[PDB]
Every structure is written in C-alpha cells, then in structure tokens.
Amino acid sequence: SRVAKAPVVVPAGVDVKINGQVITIKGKNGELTRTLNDAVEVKHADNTLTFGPRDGYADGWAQAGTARALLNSMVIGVTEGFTKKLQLVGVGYRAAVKGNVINLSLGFSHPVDHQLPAGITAECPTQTEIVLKGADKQVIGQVAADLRAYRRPEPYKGKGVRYADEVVRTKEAKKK
Amino acid sequence: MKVRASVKKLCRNCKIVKRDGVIRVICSAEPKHKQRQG
Amino acid sequence: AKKVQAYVKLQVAAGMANPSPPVGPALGQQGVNIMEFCKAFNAKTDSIEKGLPIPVVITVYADRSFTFVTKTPPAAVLLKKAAGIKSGSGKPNKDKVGKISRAQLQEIAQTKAADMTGADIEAMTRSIEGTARSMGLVVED
Amino acid sequence: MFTINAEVRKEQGKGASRRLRAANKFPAIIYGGKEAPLAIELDHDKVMNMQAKAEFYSEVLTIVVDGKEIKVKAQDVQRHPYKPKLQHIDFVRA
Amino acid sequence: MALNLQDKQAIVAEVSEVAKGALSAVVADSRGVTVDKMTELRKAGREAGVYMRVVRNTLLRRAVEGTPFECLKDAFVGPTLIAYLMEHPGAAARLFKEFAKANAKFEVKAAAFEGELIPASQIDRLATLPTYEEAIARLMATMKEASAGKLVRTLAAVREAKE
RNA sequence: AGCCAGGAUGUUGGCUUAGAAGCAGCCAUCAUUUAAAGAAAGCGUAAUAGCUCACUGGUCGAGUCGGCCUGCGCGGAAGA
Numbered sequence: 001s002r003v004a005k006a007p008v009v010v011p012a013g014v015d016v017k018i019n020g021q022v023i024t025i026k027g028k029n030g031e032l033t034r035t036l037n038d039a040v041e042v043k044h045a046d047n048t049l050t051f052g053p054r055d056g057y058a059d060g061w062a063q064a065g066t067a068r069a070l071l072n073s074m075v076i077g078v079t080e081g082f083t084k085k086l087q088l089v090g091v092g093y094r095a096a097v098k099g100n101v102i103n104l105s106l107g108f109s110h111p112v113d114h115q116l117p118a119g120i121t122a123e124c125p126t127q128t129e130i131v132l133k134g135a136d137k138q139v140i141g142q143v144a145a146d147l148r149a150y151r152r153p154e155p156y157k158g159k160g161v162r163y164a165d166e167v168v169r170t171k172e173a174k175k176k
Numbered sequence: 177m178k179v180r181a182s183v184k185k186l187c188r189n190c191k192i193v194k195r196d197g198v199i200r201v202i203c204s205a206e207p208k209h210k211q212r213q214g
Numbered sequence: 215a216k217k218v219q220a221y222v223k224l225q226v227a228a229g230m231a232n233p234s235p236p237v238g239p240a241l242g243q244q245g246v247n248i249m250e251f252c253k254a255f256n257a258k259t260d261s262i263e264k265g266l267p268i269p270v271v272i273t274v275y276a277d278r279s280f281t282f283v284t285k286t287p288p289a290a291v292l293l294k295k296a297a298g299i300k301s302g303s304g305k306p307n308k309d310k311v312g313k314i315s316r317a318q319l320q321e322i323a324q325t326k327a328a329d330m331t332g333a334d335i336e337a338m339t340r341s342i343e344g345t346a347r348s349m350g351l352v353v354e355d
Numbered sequence: 356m357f358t359i360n361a362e363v364r365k366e367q368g369k370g371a372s373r374r375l376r377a378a379n380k381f382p383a384i385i386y387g388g389k390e391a392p393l394a395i396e397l398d399h400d401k402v403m404n405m406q407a408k409a410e411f412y413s414e415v416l417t418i419v420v421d422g423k424e425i426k427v428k429a430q431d432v433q434r435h436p437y438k439p440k441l442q443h444i445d446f447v448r449a
Numbered sequence: 450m451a452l453n454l455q456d457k458q459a460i461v462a463e464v465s466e467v468a469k470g471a472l473s474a475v476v477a478d479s480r481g482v483t484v485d486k487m488t489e490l491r492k493a494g495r496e497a498g499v500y501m502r503v504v505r506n507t508l509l510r511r512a513v514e515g516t517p518f519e520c521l522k523d524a525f526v527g528p529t530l531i532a533y534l535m536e537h538p539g540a541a542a543r544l545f546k547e548f549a550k551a552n553a554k555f556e557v558k559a560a561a562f563e564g565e566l567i568p569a570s571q572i573d574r575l576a577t578l579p580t581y582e583e584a585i586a587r588l589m590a591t592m593k594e595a596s597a598g599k600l601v602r603t604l605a606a607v608r609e610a611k612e
Numbered sequence: 613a614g615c616c617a618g619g620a621u622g623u624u625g626g627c628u629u630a631g632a633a634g635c636a637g638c639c640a641u642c643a644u645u646u647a648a649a650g651a652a653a654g655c656g657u658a659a660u661a662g663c664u665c666a667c668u669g670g671u672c673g674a675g676u677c678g679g680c681c682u683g684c685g686c687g688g689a690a691g692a
Contacts, residue, residue: 181688188653188665199687205654214687215484222660223624223633240631240658269624269633290626303627306639331621331645333493340643341622348626348640379681400681439680459647479670483620486646505647505669530617530670532647
C-alpha cells in the first residue's frame with residue numbers, strides 16, 4: 001500500500017543490477033551498494049522500479065513498502081549522496097578529522113579518536129561542527145548516532161554533541 | 177520510565193508503540209510519560 | 215510595521231506621571247531610564263489633562279534612550295469618570311449594578327478614529343459595546 | 356421505510372429458539388385479528404438496525420412471509436439481559 | 450461547514466461579485482501575515498471600507514468551476530493558491546494599486562498580477578485606471594499645448610543650443 | 613496524514629488586584645477583522661513574553677474516522 005505502490009524511477013545513470021532477488025545500484029558516487037529482499041517481487045521494466053507483494057504472504061506490501069523505501073534511498077544514495085551535520089556545544093569540545101578517523105575532545109580525561117566506516121567520509125568545517133556524507137543512509141545515520149553518543153546533550157546547559165535537527169529541552173534547577 | 181499494569185497515553189504527544197512483545201508509551205513532550213509493560 | 219522589537223504597557227493613572235511607588239524599577243530595563251520617562255511623556259501629556267490611562271509602544275534600538283508613539287486610551291477606565299461608580303467589575307452579573315444605555319458612552323465610541331478595526335463607522339460601535347459590560351451594566355438602549 | 360422479511364418458523368421451544376439467536380436470527384410472533392397467530396424468525400442484525408430509529412415503534416410495520424406482506428405494530432420487545440441485542444418481538448396485525 | 454448546500458453558497462453568493470463586478474484581481478499570498486488583513490482591511494478605514502473583499506476561495510473546483518457567469522479564458526485563470534478580490538460600489542480604478550503598491554514591497558508573491566475580468570484577458574498589469582479623480586492629470590494633460598510643450602523646446606535653443 | 617501559511621484587533625478585560633497586560637487568580641465569554649483566531653491549548657514570565665495549538669487556505673489525490681456484534685491471541689504474571 002502507497003509507499004509500496006508508488007514507482008521508484010531510475011534516474012539518468014544508476015545501472016540497476018537486479019539479479020533475481022539481489023538488487024544493486026551504482027552511479028555518480030557510492031561504491032555500488034546492494035541489499036536483499038524477500039516477500040516483494042520487484043520489476044525493472046522501462047524507466048522505473050515497481051514493487052508489489054507475492055501470493056501467500058501477509059507481509060506483502062508491508063515488506064514491499066520498506067522495499068520501495070530502501071531502494072528509493074539507494075538510488076538517491078549514489079545520486080545526490082546523503083547529508084549529515086552535528087555541532088559540539090560546550091567550552092572545550094572540539095572535533096578534528098586527520099584522516100578518516102575523527103579525533104574528538106569532550107572534557108573526558110582522554111581524547112576519543114573514532115574511525116569512520118566503509119563508504120563514509122567527514123569534514124570539520126569548524127572546530128565544533130562535523131559533516132559526514134555517504135551514500136548509505138543507514139550508515140551515516142549510525143555514525144552520527146555513534147559520534148553523538150560519546151556525549152549526548154544534557155538538559156541543563158545543553159552541552160554535548162547535538163545534531164541541528166535537535167530540540168534540546170533544557171530546564172531550571174530545583175528552586176533553592 | 178514507569179512500568180505499570182495499565183499504560184495509557186496521558187499527553188497529546190504521548191505515542192504507544194509495541195517494541196517486541198511489549199506495549200510501551202513514547203511521549204515526545206514529557207519524559208515522565210515514558211512507560212513500559214501493559 | 216514589522217512585528218516585535220521592544221514594547222510594553224504598565225501604568226495606573228495620568229494624574230501622576232512616572233509613578234515612584236507603583237511600578238518603580240519596573241518601567242523599562244533595556245534602554246529605559248527612570249529619571250527620563252517623564253521628560254518625553256509629560257511633553258504632550260500635559261497638553262490634554264492628567265488622570266487617565268496612557269499605554270504606549272517603546273521603539274528600542276541601541277542609542278542611549280528610546281522613542282514611543284501612543285494612541286487612543288481604553289474605554290474601560292472611562293467608566294470611572296464617564297459612566298458611574300469609581301470601581302468597575304467587582305460585582306459582575308449577579309445583580310444589575312450600574313446602567314449605561316444607547317446615549318451614554320456614545321461619543322466614547324467616537325474618540326478612537328484611526329484606532330478602530332471597525333471600518334464601518336456604525337459597526338465599530340459594536341466593539342466598545344462591551345468595554346462597559348465587564349462588570350454587568352445592562353443597556354437601556 | 357420499515358420493511359423486514361422472515362420465514363414461518365418450522366420449530367418452537369427454547370431449543371430452536373436458542374439455535375436462532377445462535378445463527379444470528381431470532382424468534383418473533385404475530386397475533387391479532389380473526390386470524391390465528393403466526394410464528395416467525397427475523398434476521399437479527401437487520402432488524403437491530405430498525406429498532407434503533409425511534410420511528411420503529413410508531414409508524415406501522417410490515418412483514419414478509421414467503422412474500423405475502425402483513426403489516427403490524429411493534430407490540431412488545433424482549434431485549435437481552437446485558438448486551439445490545441434482541442430476544443423476541445411481539446407483533447399485532449393491527 | 451456543510452456539503453453542497455454550503456459549497457454552492459460560497460459560490461453564487463461571492464460569484465455575484467463577478468457578474469456585477471467592478472474591477473478584478475487574483476493574488477496568491479504564500480506566507481501571508483495578519484497585516485494582510487491589517488492592510489486591504491486597514492486602508493478600508495479612512496480610504497475604503499466593506500466595499501472590498503479578497504475571500505481566499507481559490508478552491509478552484511469551487512471558485513473557477515463556480516463562475517458560469519461568463520468569465521471564459523479562466524479555465525486557466527485559477528492556478529494553485531489564490532485570493533480573488535472584487536468591488537461593488539465606487540469606481541473600478543484605485544483597487545489595482547492597493548496591490549500593485551503593496552505586494553511590490555515584498556508582501557508575499559503577487560501572482561505577478563495575472564490580470565482578471567472587465568476586459569477579460571491574461572497576464573501583464575496596467576494602471577490606466579488609478580489615474581482617475583486625479584483630474585489634474587487631465588489638466589497638465591494638455592501640456593499647456595501652446596505653453597509648456599513650447600517653453601520646453603522652442604526655448605531650449607538658448608539653454609542648450611548656443612555654442 | 614504529512615508538508616506550506618495565518619491565529620489578531622476592541623483588550624493590557626475589569627477585578628479580593630503589593631505588580632497580573634488570555635492561563636495560582638475572581639466573575640464574565642460577548643462584538644468586529646476577516647477564508648480562520650478561542651479574552652483562548654501548552655511550555656514558561658519580575659511582567660510583557662519568544663514560540664507552538666483548535667479552526668481556514670495551499671500542496672498531494674483515494675480513501676478515511678470511530679463506535680457496535682462476533683472468533684483467536686498480547687501484557688498483567690516473582691521462589692527457594
């Protein structure tokens with residue numbers, strides 16, 4: 001239903017290596033990328049990718065919508081690639097990136113070097129911001145969550161590693 | 177959070193999802209509305 | 215106009231400008247002096263009379279003092295000088311207190327010329343039609 | 356609008372009666388006039404709809420036996436002790 | 450609200466401002482503020498009034514489909530977000546300016562003035578209307594004929610031709 | 613359902629009000645501006661607030677909302 005129904009359209013580029021039940025997309029950037037499916041029969045045909053269920057599967061659609069979804073972010077994956085961005089709040093917090101391993105400093109009694117995964121790179125436009133692009137939505141999302149983890153944002157002064165798409169509650173102390 | 181025999185959505189931004197065999201309540205506004213088991 | 219930059223409205227009476235006991239250190243603190251809020255106020259306040267409410271905006275920038283531009287007063291306070299009793303609410307609609315009709319407060323709905331979102335000169339009469347009912351004052355209209 | 360059909364009950368006793376409401380049907384009787392009373396079974400979910408409209412007790416009613424129309428009035432209705440469902444309805448050929 | 454009984458309402462009722470319509474303007478207001486109603490409604494104070502309405506009814510299917518009162522070429526005239534405006538009393542001048550000299554000052558898009566009824570055409574604003582009751586525009590309009598239009602050239606040979 | 617916009621003006625409503633200008637408060641909830649905006653939902657004021665809700669417009673375009681009668685399951689559910 002819906003998201004599933006809705007076609008995916010393979011932009012001018014990406015090859016679409018639909019091999020039986022293993023789909024692979026490669027283009028602009030992004031070292032290919034390919035995932036597996038299950039109760040959804042996908043069809044290339046013309047200039048798009050259609051997603052539907054399969055007889056005898058109550059998962060149908062449900063498994064198909066996530067299908068669309070994934071592939072749809074796989075196209076754009078290699079296409080425009082995927083964004084990111086995080087910003088360190090708090091005096092003494094600093095990012096670095098001196099390779100593909102980010103070196104963070106968060107008020108601990110030690111540095112915190114963090115090695116980037118496979119197809120993911122990052123830059124520190126500022127001593128307190130981190131932008132890491134990649135074609136795999138599922139991994140940038142992670143690497144982000146992971147970096148942040150080292151020092152989430154505490155609800156008092158707000159210090160810590162936040163995104164930008166945050167909200168940061170923040171409240172007052174117990175009165176006197 | 178708070179584990180009660182009856183979960184119930186209190187707030188308007190309080191959600192109710194079933195992660196695993198467990199019904200829980202995810203209230204985005206107030207953490208105090210975070211609940212498990214039910 | 216734009217939206218919001220800096221402005222409020224706290225006062226008791228024009229009979230006594232820049233009150234000392236009332237608001238006190240609560241009459242402007244972001245570019246507002248307390249010994250100057252009586253040199254730009256009474257500059258035109260003493261041009262009509264003293265003893266009626268006078269709220270106003272407070273255009274603030276970052277150049278020492280400030281600048282304001284007030285306008286028509288509330289038609290609720292005019293019930294202590296142009297209507298009846300000294301007070302107002304207190305005894306709401308539990309027993310017919312004072313009583314104002316079609317005649318009274320008539321021209322009090324004529325003082326706010328430019329300040330009346332009631333285009334229809336006639337319809338703009340329905341607006342103040344309540345600035346004398348916040349305490350129960352049946353109209354003999 | 357009140358028009359409901361049924362079938363001449365082939366049985367009786369609380370037996371058939373409990374088998375009726377069991378299969379989403381229910382007993383009903385039609386008496387009055389110089390005509391001898393008649394046993395009927397109506398489809399519950401249908402008539403449960405009509406009994407809702409406050410009009411079901413005023414504007415005369417009409418029955419259909421093997422397609423023969425009778426028309427009567429909702430004389431007496433037995434409801435269920437604790438659930439919104441019918442038990443049995445009396446009908447008079449008036 | 451209400452279905453057809455209410456839908457038909459917003460139609461004819463306001464579509465009367467189309468059959469017997471003075472002027473006509475179609476302006477979208479993406480990102481409109483309250484000043485939007487503190488302007489066309491404010492200028493209604495000491496220079497207008499309840500003689501103007503911009504009832505955002507671009508329901509198209511309601512606004513457009515709801516104009517059997519001859520307004521052809523409009524099967525196109527009713528795109529996306531809209532906020533039609535019409536007049537009953539007064540002339541058919543000014544009005545265009547309330548928009549032309551407002552929306553030109555940011556105040557959200559102005560549908561680039563897609564033009565409306567009266568002559569019944571397309572897009573490309575005019576202004577040969579607001580010049581009305583500004584009769585003095587018909588006064589100097591003679592450019593003194595003999596005078597000015599002369600003292601501007603026939604006597605420009607001295608302050609611009611003696612070399 | 614998202615997403616895009618607005619939600620004021622009479623009004624700072626007067627009031628037991630130290631100061632309350634919708635919201636610890638009292639009694640009241642009426643009338644314009646409009647497509648819609650309640651003296652009104654919440655966060656929270658030294659107090660205005662900043663900033664978001666009912667409700668209306670736009671985008672998208674086929675279904676969507678919740679009760680009733682029934683069948684089978686989930687949590688509740690810790691011990692030597």
